[PDB]
Design a protein around this ligand. Sequence first.
Ligand SMILES: [Mg+2]
Ligand SMILES: [Mg+2]
Length: 55
Amino acid sequence: TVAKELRQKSSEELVKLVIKLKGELLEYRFKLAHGELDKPHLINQTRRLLATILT
RNA sequence: AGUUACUAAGGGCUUAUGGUGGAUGCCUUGGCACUAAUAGGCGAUGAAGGACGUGUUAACCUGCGAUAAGCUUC
Ligand SMILES: [Mg+2]
Ligand SMILES: [Mg+2]
């Protein structure tokens, strides 16, 4: 399902996606370390989407 | 003058009860010995075995490997 959407995308757009999700993942981990993450599941979703884009 | 019971500090016997203890009985996500087939290897495209790390999840165990409690396809 998600893999189909990324397959339609080109390569350059994918590397933009991976860097943006990397940045967001760092922010989520920092906010969690400050006790300011209301939604604690976005860390897992970011990592899975990151792993899928890598695949 | 004569023959005399009561005493139980404590102990003994019988029976009943309580406590420590896990023997006997029943059972088992565990072992043992084989039968009928399959198969008889893995590794420089990095092995067997380990260390470390990975959670929204204290530690331990299991899974996994910076794509880290999972990724794609049929
Ligand atoms: Mg007495
Ligand atoms: Mg007595």
